[PDB]
Amino acid sequence: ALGKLQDVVNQNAQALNTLVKQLSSNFGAISSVLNDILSRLDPPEAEVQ
């Protein structure tokens, strides 16, 4: 019966989850964590990724 309300909450949480998971995507960079690229590459090379 409470579908109309549960679904809204589900959608919001889904959006949040998708947005958070987008942080793990490489997007073509060598690593998905900024700290790794910073600690491993020089700024002239780090900025490319």
Binding site: I30, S39, R40, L41, D42, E45
Partner: protein
């Protein structure tokens, strides 16, 4: 070269700025990491292939 000799290195602390400081190496390049930042960066194993 066909029999390149590989040495595994583990359980030890070694600096890395010394090699970069020494200019006796005609070519000194790195891929995926910077030699300067390499000093303070641990690793599980190192392979030296000569």
């Amino acid at each position: 070269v066909y029999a390149w000799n590989r040495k595994r290195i583990s359980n030890c602390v070694a600096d890395y700025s010394v090699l970069y400081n020494s200019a006796s190496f005609s070519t000194f390049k790195c891929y995926g990491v910077s030699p300067t930042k390499l000093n303070d960066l641990c690793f599980t194993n190192v392979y030296a292939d000569s």
